[PDB]
Structure 1
Amino acid sequence: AMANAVIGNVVTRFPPEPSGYLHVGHAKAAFLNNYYAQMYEGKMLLRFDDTNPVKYEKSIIEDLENLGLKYEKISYSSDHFDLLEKYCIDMIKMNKAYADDTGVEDMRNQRGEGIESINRNNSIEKNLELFNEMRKGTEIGQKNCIRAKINMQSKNKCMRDPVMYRCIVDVPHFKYKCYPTYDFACPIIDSIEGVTHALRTNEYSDRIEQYNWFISTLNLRKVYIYEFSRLAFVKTVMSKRKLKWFVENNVVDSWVDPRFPTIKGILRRGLTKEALFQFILEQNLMQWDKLWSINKQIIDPIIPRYAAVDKNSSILLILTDLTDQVIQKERDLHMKNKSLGTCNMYYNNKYLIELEDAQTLLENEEITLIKLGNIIIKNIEKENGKIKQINALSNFHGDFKTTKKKIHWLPYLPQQLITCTLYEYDHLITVDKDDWTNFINFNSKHETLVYAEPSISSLKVSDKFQFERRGYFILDKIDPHHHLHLIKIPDG
């Protein structure tokens, strides 16, 4: 619900702090801002919220690009520090703000007990003196903050004289020695940037009364607040500190690791932006499984299908009636989607099949090799207990419909088969949500070496596809000697 929204006059803003990498929760915020802007044919601003001193701008902009979220203009909170100072002074002159040198603990217990600080009654001229001490960075100023004068007895703790301005000399941004708080800066900056609908998380809904109080007390143009719920996932860390620990201790080898909930992370993992947006629209800690099922339903109709077998469990099958001449046939990349085009299939008398499949056959069973035809299994050579080889006869014109058992396969053409590594990942932690390192899966990157069809040479980095009867994958990397690294996409 966007209050009084008018087509062509809606302005939202996405306000990420430029102190970290965007993650999936940020994505819900950025997407809802864009979605309401587009709904009303309006504008979405990008504001780097650097209100308090602590270069990720490029990462953030690149992730906004990758999600297809455009914005009309980029600004920084700090662009308005001058004007915020002016407004702080105006509020002192209206006796709506005062300089308080009370310590933090006693301020908090005074606030909890509705006790007005003795400084609440400071004169205007004294309040201004003390604000200037804060601006100059003196020890006097470092002892003081500026609070708003609202209502200490209010049932809303955010209306009990919230801090507006603080003296921060300790750390660099050293130009300013006092800084507005987020609670004071946000309504003011939203007003002066022309925001009409300021989106905000569910957490602390008490601050809306405060935000409106700042707007109206300064007689600024009104801004509506819309609220949405935070997006958080089970078995997922999103703290900056915890992610930092993972990286520094070589649990992952970068901040783009496909187990990370960063935007880069889960796009590398195979997620489409359409899947994320649709999940947000059609939906506390969420379960990943509906997100990955929506991804599966989105990607399955528009990705090619290839075959792969385990490079070392796979067993040799020989159709003894054929020769070693390699026959080539054109086939569809997608059986139900002719637009994805064709590739080349190659066959001979020698094949590789999966050992889990080969253990399931018995003499003179009829089965099907997908995209090729039927075969009659004749002999199972078991040397030293394990299956060593399977001999069968071609029956390519027999009816595959009469077969309950249809399997995938590779031609045994090793100078043409492409070697690949499958990376299957799991959650970095084991519980849903200080000894926390006791619950890390230090072994959540399972690798499998496989052969894949020659035609898979056609793929480019980041293409998605399906391995027959294996699952869904994204091409992450291409090695020297044409060796591919493929990440399994979860499918719910």
Structure 2
Amino acid sequence: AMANAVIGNVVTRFPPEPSGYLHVGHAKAAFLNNYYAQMYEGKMLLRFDDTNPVLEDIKYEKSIIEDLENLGLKYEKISYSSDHFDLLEKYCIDMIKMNKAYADDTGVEDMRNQRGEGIESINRNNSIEKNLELFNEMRKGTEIGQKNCIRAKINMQSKNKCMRDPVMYRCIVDVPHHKHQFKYKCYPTYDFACPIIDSIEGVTHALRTNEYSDRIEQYNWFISTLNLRKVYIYEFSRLAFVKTVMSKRKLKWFVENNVVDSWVDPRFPTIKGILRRGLTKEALFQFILEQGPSKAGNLMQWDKLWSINKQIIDPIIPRYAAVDKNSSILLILTDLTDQVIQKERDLHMKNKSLGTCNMYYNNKYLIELEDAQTLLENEEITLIKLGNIIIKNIEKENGKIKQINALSNFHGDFKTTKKKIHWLPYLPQQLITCTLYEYDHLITVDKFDWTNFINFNSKHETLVYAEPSISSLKVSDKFQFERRGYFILDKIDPHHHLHLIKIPDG
């Protein structure tokens, strides 16, 4: 929401942590921050949220940047939360001097329980000078410092759990920070860092997933307690899908146990994986704008997303033909010659804009086995884009159909017939060999021994022959295979062997 937004003067920010790849969850946040900045002719910041040290097997900044670019989302400037550590320490000391923060040595358990029943910690009435001595203990990372945290002094009997003295600063000496190594011994918490950094970076409208705690009241308290320029904060609903593993632990488990080969595998929820699967950014954003709110912990179905994507791509992608390579059946039109005839057709029967292709045909054709099995003698069918034929005799040898002889009747009425089938010309030196990948979800349950619900058999490969014209497609082109479905060209192997990912269609 854009409470009191001023045209030309809105600043939003997308703040992903830099210890992982962007995934579809991130997408709603990135999109809404851009949608509202553009609505008000404002700007969107990119901020890498690195307030606390992590052990990162990579610097994900570059991948996050390129995913944002691939979604069309541009940002005015890039910052890191850790850019503001010194300022945040300043503000922590300010808090301490106004008696709005104190140092607490209480253990984890005792502190959680105290907060539950609303009893004030023994240290809540520590003196300002003592709180400062202990904060400096934390700053230098001494034995005493590592036993202390800084907490906000708010209201322990508040109805809101987030207002009962939330931690502001922790002392962490063992894990190094990806930017500052061990230069910092204490680190601000997310709850403290977030409002201050928003105010001092010039954010006007902070957007955030609803975490179903009233963190908004606490955020505002920090801004008002410290007398900072005010920031509006609004919480939207999280985007999460059924049958989708988001736990980083389980995702790396997949990678390491060779269920998938990389984090870009098309079954992964990463932005790259799902674009590899054939989703358009236009579909993602339209789905987001149209989905409406969702309540706590609800999970979307994939069907409306892939149906929107289908409606988008159907009118602007070319159509080709493909048959099963190993089980295709030879069809002979015994009235024609083996002279190869070549005729121009539209790549799209309703969109001459995408242009023309060349169609080759012969006396000899390949058709699908399941199509051959339905044919019987003196049946008038239609070879799509070519014309009617009349089947003559099905030459079956020991049950396995081996041949079908027919006769051209191309000038017959293509409406009379009810069987319309796709075909390839039998020109093996020109047909394109392709591998087709039909993917399925990595787990079988909508949500969570979990290894018991992994679909290890979720990458189905099949080998096909495709029409020659498909040679013109470049990597990441999307298209339709007649009577088969929607596909995206993923890779061109040696000898122009194509690797094609079936796009879910809903």
Q: TM-score range by the shorter chain?
A: over 0.9
When structure 1 is superposed on structure 2, of 198-207 and 355-364 the one drifting more is: 198-207
Question: Could you tell me how far apart the structure 1 residues matched to 2:448 and 2:171 are?
Answer: 32
Q: Deviations over 1:335-361 (max 9, x none)?
A: 000000001000000000101111111
Name stretches of at least 5 consecutive residues in structure 1 with no aligned partner.
none
How well do the aligned residues superpose, as a CA RMSD in angstroms?
0.8
Q: Residues 434 and 423 (structure 1 numbering): CA distance in 2 closer, same or farther, change over 3 Å?
A: closer
**Deviation of 1:386 (Å):** 2.1
The DSSP-based 3-state class of the residue aligned with 1:460 is: coil
Question: Could you tell me how far apart the structure 1 residues matched to 2:71 and 2:213 are?
Answer: 28
**Deviation of 1:170 (Å):** 1.2
Q: 1:392-431 counterparts in 2 under 5 A?
A: 392-431=406-445
2:9/2:42 contact within 8 Å kept: yes
Q: Deviations over 1:438-477 (max 9, x none)?
A: 1101110001100000000000000000000000000000
Question: Could you tell me how far apart the structure 2 residues matched to 1:483 and 1:355 are?
Answer: 23
Question: Could you tell me how far apart the structure 2 residues matched to 1:418 and 1:359 are?
Answer: 25
When structure 1 is superposed on structure 2, of 196-205 and 459-468 the one drifting more is: 196-205
Aligned to 1:2: 2
Q: Deviations over 1:14-54 (max 9, x none)?
A: 00000101100101110000001000010000000000000
1:363 aligns with 2:377: yes
1:132 aligns with 2:164: no
Question: Could you tell me how far apart the structure 2 residues matched to 1:59 and 1:278 are?
Answer: 24
Question: Could you tell me how far apart the structure 1 residues matched to 2:128 and 2:261 are?
Answer: 56
When structure 1 is superposed on structure 2, of 201-210 and 298-307 the one drifting more is: 201-210
Taking only the aligned residue pairs, the percentage that are identical comes to: 100
**Deviation of 1:176 (Å):** 0.5
Q: Deviations over 1:382-427 (max 9, x none)?
A: 1101211111110111110111111100000000000000000000
Question: Could you tell me how far apart the structure 2 residues matched to 1:479 and 1:168 are?
Answer: 49
Question: Could you tell me how far apart the structure 2 residues matched to 1:216 and 1:204 are?
Answer: 22
Question: Could you tell me how far apart the structure 2 residues matched to 1:204 and 1:132 are?
Answer: 34
Question: Could you tell me how far apart the structure 2 residues matched to 1:387 and 1:195 are?
Answer: 70
2:348/2:354 contact within 8 Å kept: yes
Aligned to 2:106: 102
**Deviation of 1:204 (Å):** 3.0
Q: Deviations over 1:158-216 (max 9, x none)?
A: 10000000111111009100000000000000000000111011113411000000000
**Deviation of 1:434 (Å):** 9.6
Question: Could you tell me how far apart the structure 2 residues matched to 1:391 and 1:155 are?
Answer: 83
Q: Deviations over 1:312-337 (max 9, x none)?
A: 11111000000000000011000000
Q: 1:139-288 counterparts in 2 under 5 A?
A: 139-173=143-177, 175-283=183-291, 284-288=298-302
Question: Could you tell me how far apart the structure 1 residues matched to 2:337 and 2:102 are?
Answer: 94
Question: Could you tell me how far apart the structure 2 residues matched to 1:118 and 1:157 are?
Answer: 19
Question: Could you tell me how far apart the structure 2 residues matched to 1:259 and 1:154 are?
Answer: 45
When structure 1 is superposed on structure 2, of 165-174 and 178-187 the one drifting more is: 165-174
Question: Could you tell me how far apart the structure 2 residues matched to 1:149 and 1:240 are?
Answer: 34
Question: Could you tell me how far apart the structure 2 residues matched to 1:356 and 1:281 are?
Answer: 42
Question: Could you tell me how far apart the structure 1 residues matched to 2:78 and 2:365 are?
Answer: 58
Question: After the TM superposition, which segments of 4 or more aligned residues of structure 1 sit over 4 Å from their partners?
Answer: none
Question: Could you tell me how far apart the structure 1 residues matched to 2:6 and 2:65 are?
Answer: 28
**Deviation of 1:481 (Å):** 1.1
Question: Could you tell me how far apart the structure 1 residues matched to 2:336 and 2:154 are?
Answer: 91
1:481 aligns with 2:495: yes
Question: Could you tell me how far apart the structure 2 residues matched to 1:439 and 1:338 are?
Answer: 47
**Deviation of 1:297 (Å):** 0.4
Question: Could you tell me how far apart the structure 2 residues matched to 1:371 and 1:94 are?
Answer: 81
The DSSP-based 3-state class of the residue aligned with 1:401 is: coil
Question: Could you tell me how far apart the structure 1 residues matched to 2:160 and 2:267 are?
Answer: 41
Q: Deviations over 1:55-110 (max 9, x none)?
A: 00001001001100000000000000000000000010100001111111101111
Q: 1:87-126 counterparts in 2 under 5 A?
A: 87-126=91-130
The DSSP-based 3-state class of the residue aligned with 1:71 is: coil
Question: Could you tell me how far apart the structure 2 residues matched to 1:244 and 1:464 are?
Answer: 30
Name stretches of at least 5 consecutive residues in structure 2 with no aligned partner.
292-297
The DSSP-based 3-state class of the residue aligned with 1:79 is: helix
Question: Could you tell me how far apart the structure 2 residues matched to 1:288 and 1:170 are?
Answer: 42
When structure 1 is superposed on structure 2, of 439-448 and 427-436 the one drifting more is: 427-436
Aligned to 2:450: 436
2:49/2:80 contact within 8 Å kept: yes
Question: Could you tell me how far apart the structure 1 residues matched to 2:334 and 2:217 are?
Answer: 82
Question: Could you tell me how far apart the structure 1 residues matched to 2:433 and 2:265 are?
Answer: 22
2:388/2:411 contact within 8 Å kept: yes
Aligned to 1:456: 470
Q: Deviations over 1:359-385 (max 9, x none)?
A: 111110100001101101111111101
The DSSP-based 3-state class of the residue aligned with 1:102 is: coil
The DSSP-based 3-state class of the residue aligned with 1:379 is: strand
Question: Could you tell me how far apart the structure 2 residues matched to 1:106 and 1:379 are?
Answer: 86
The DSSP-based 3-state class of the residue aligned with 2:494 is: coil
**Deviation of 1:144 (Å):** 0.7
The DSSP-based 3-state class of the residue aligned with 1:359 is: helix
Question: Could you tell me how far apart the structure 1 residues matched to 2:164 and 2:86 are?
Answer: 26
Question: Could you tell me how far apart the structure 2 residues matched to 1:131 and 1:450 are?
Answer: 68
When structure 1 is superposed on structure 2, of 98-107 and 434-443 the one drifting more is: 434-443
2:162/2:213 contact within 8 Å kept: no
Question: Could you tell me how far apart the structure 2 residues matched to 1:113 and 1:396 are?
Answer: 85
Question: Could you tell me how far apart the structure 2 residues matched to 1:434 and 1:426 are?
Answer: 18
Question: Could you tell me how far apart the structure 2 residues matched to 1:377 and 1:289 are?
Answer: 40
Q: Deviations over 1:127-148 (max 9, x none)?
A: 1000000001111111111101
**Deviation of 1:276 (Å):** 0.3
Aligned to 1:17: 17
**Deviation of 1:118 (Å):** 1.1
Aligned to 2:295: none
How many residue pairs get aligned? The number is 492
Question: Could you tell me how far apart the structure 2 residues matched to 1:276 and 1:316 are?
Answer: 43
The DSSP-based 3-state class of the residue aligned with 2:327 is: coil
Q: Deviations over 1:215-246 (max 9, x none)?
A: 00000011111111111111110111111000
